[PDB]
Design a binder for this molecule. Structure first.
Ligand code: NAP
Ligand code: NAP
Ligand code: CA
Ligand code: CA
Ligand code: CA
Ligand code: CA
Ligand code: CA
Lengths: 258, 262
C-alpha cells in the first residue's frame, strides 16, 4: 500500500463526496447536544463504510461516534472531523471543512483539509509535500507577531490576555473552523491560530502540515501534543510562536476562569 | 447620449471584469507604505485601481465626480449631480497579509440618491451588485431579502479592538457566534446574504459604506448610525448594517452602560 495509492483512494472519495453533500444540505436537519447535523453524521458514516471496504484493518477516531475502543498502540488509524465548522455550515453554508488524518504506528503519513464550499483540497503527504489543489505549498515567510494577523476565540480567554494579543498583533481575524483558520497559518495568511480546548479531530491533519511546512504546533506550554488526546494548542509561524506563548502565559495565564 | 441605468451598469461591470486582468500584476510587484501610522496601510494596488477608475470616468462620464479613499476630497459638495464613491481596495490589511478577503467598492449617486452599487470580491470572483429598479445580484444570481434573524440565532461581526471589552462581551453573550472577515464590504455582504445578522463599523469613511445603502434598501436591511439615524453618504458615521430582526437589540447593547467606546 504505497502512500500514493492510499492518497488516490482518499482524494477520489473526497471528490465523490461533492456529489453527496448538496443533497444532505437540501435535507438538512439540526440538533443540539448540550450543534450537529445530518451532514456531520452522514459524511462520517460513509467514511466508515469506505474504510470497511478498502481498509478493513484500519480504525476510525471521529467526532460523531464513541471512541472508547481506541488505544495508544494501534497500527492504522484515521482521525476524522466530518464537518469542522458546523456552526458555519448551519448559519452560512460556507467556511467549513472536512478533516482527515492517517497515522501509521502513530506517525502522521497523510492529512486532508477539504474546504468543500470553495472546492479547495489541502493535502499533506509524507515524502511528497503539502498541496492546495495540487499547487505545492512551501514554508511561509517569517512573520513576527507585530506584522501578523492572529486568530483565536476571544470569548473563552481572560480579557487581559485577549487585549495583550490585540495590542501585539497586526490585526485579528476569525474564520471559525479550526481546520481553516489553521490552513491560513500554513499558507502564511495568519501568524498563528489558537484553540484552547480542541478534540483530536479538530487538529488531526495539522500535525503533518506543521512538520512539512516548518510551522510550530504545540500546547500552550510549548509541549508536543498527543494526537490521541486533545490539548490546548497553537499552530504558528516559527517567527511568532514564542511571543504568542509568552503572552498567553503572562498575567496568571489565558484561561477565563482560574 | 442619455444613458439608462442598465447601460451604465454594463460599462461598470465590464471595467470590473477587465480589472481582473490588471490586478495579478499589481500584486506581483506589490509595495506597501504607511499613511497615518503603523497600522494604516496603502499599496500600489489601492492607488492604481483608483487612478484607472478616474481615467475610466474621464473618458466615459466626464461630468461625473469621484469621492475616493486615496485622493483629496475637499472639492466634493452636497449638491453634486453625478457622484461616484469608491474604495479601490477595501480590506488593504487583508490584501497585504493574505492576498484574500478584500474587495472593490463602487457606488453611484444621482442627485444624492443611490442608483448603482458594487462590491467586487475579486479573490473569489463574486460581483455583488445593486441596481435601482432591477434588484441586487451576486454574479447575476438575484439576491432576496434574508430570513429574519434574531440576535441570539445570528452571527455578528465587528472590530472588537476598537470597543470597550465590557460591551464586546455583552455582544458575544447575546449572539449565536462571532466572525470577522475584516473588510467592511464583505462583512456587510454576509449580512445582505443572511450569513451574518449584523456588521458594525464604529468609524467608517464614506467609501467603506457607499455601496451598502442601495443593498440595504433593496434587500430590506436596516442600515443606520449606532443611534438609529440615517447616515449621510457624503460623511462617515458610526454604523451598523443589520438584518431587520436583530437591529434594535444590537443598538440597545451598544448604547447600554455608558456606551461602546474606548
Ligand atoms: N477554546 C476555544 O478556542 C473555542 C473555540 C470555539 C468554540 N468553543 C466552545 O464551543 C461552544 C460553541 O462554540 P463557538 O460558537 O464559540 O465556536 P464555534 O464557532 O461553534 O466552533 C468553532 C471551532 O471550534 C470547534 N469547537 C466546537 N466546540 C468546541 C469546544 N467546546 N472547544 C473547542 N473547540 C470547539 C469547532 O469544531 P466543530 O465545528 O467541529 O464543532 C470549530 O472548529 C462554546 O460553548 C465555546 O466555549 C471554544
Ligand atoms: N497591534 C495594534 O496595536 C493594533 C492592531 C490592529 C488595530 N489597531 C487599532 O485599530 C484600528 C483599526 O485597524 P485594523 O487593522 O483593525 O483595521 P482593518 O482590519 O485594517 O480594517 C477593517 C475594515 O475597516 C476599515 N478601516 C480601516 N481603518 C479604519 C478605521 N480607522 N476606522 C474604521 N474602519 C477602518 C477597512 O478599510 P480599508 O482597508 O479599506 O481602509 C476595512 O473595511 C487602528 O486605528 C489601530 O490603532 C491596533
Ligand atoms: Ca465537527
Ligand atoms: Ca471541529
Ligand atoms: Ca485604508
Ligand atoms: Ca481602502
Ligand atoms: Ca475600506
Amino acid at each position: 500500500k504505497t502512500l500514493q495509492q492510499i492518497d488516490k483512494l482518499i482524494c477520489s472519495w473526497l471528490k465523490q463526496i461533492d456529489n453527496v453533500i448538496p443533497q444532505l444540505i437540501m435535507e438538512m436537519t439540526t440538533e443540539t447536544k448540550r450543534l450537529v447535523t445530518n451532514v456531520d453524521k452522514q459524511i462520517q458514516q460513509q467514511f466508515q463504510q469506505f474504510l470497511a471496504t478498502y481498509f478493513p484493518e484500519h480504525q476510525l477516531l471521529a467526532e460523531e461516534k464513541s471512541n472508547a475502543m481506541i488505544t495508544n498502540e494501534i497500527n492504522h488509524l484515521w482521525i476524522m472531523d466530518p464537518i469542522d465548522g458546523t456552526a458555519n455550515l448551519v448559519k452560512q453554508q460556507e467556511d467549513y471543512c472536512i478533516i482527515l488524518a492517517y497515522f501509521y504506528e502513530g506517525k502522521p503519513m497523510l492529512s486532508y483539509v477539504y474546504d468543500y464550499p470553495h472546492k479547495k483540497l489541502y493535502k499533506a503527504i509524507r515524502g511528497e509535500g503539502a498541496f492546495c489543489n495540487g499547487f505545492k505549498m512551501e514554508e511561509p515567510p517569517s512573520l513576527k507577531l507585530e506584522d501578523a494577523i492572529i486568530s483565536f476565540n476571544a470569548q473563552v480567554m481572560n480579557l487581559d490576555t485577549v487585549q495583550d494579543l490585540f495590542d501585539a498583533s497586526f490585526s485579528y481575524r476569525l474564520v471559525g473552523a479550526c481546520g481553516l483558520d489553521s490552513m491560513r497559518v500554513a499558507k502564511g495568511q495568519f501568524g498563528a491560530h489558537i484553540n484552547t480546548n480542541p478534540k483530536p479531530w479538530d487538529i488531526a491533519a495539522q500535525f503533518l502540515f506543521a512538520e512539512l511546512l516548518n510551522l510550530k504546533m504545540t500546547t500552550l506550554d510549548g509541549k508536543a501534543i498527543d494526537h490521541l488526546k486533545g490539548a490546548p494548542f497553537i499552530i504558528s509561524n516559527k517567527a511568532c510562536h514564542e511571543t504568542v506563548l509568552k503572552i498567553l502565559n503572562a498575567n496568571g495565564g489565558y484561561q477565563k476562569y482560574r
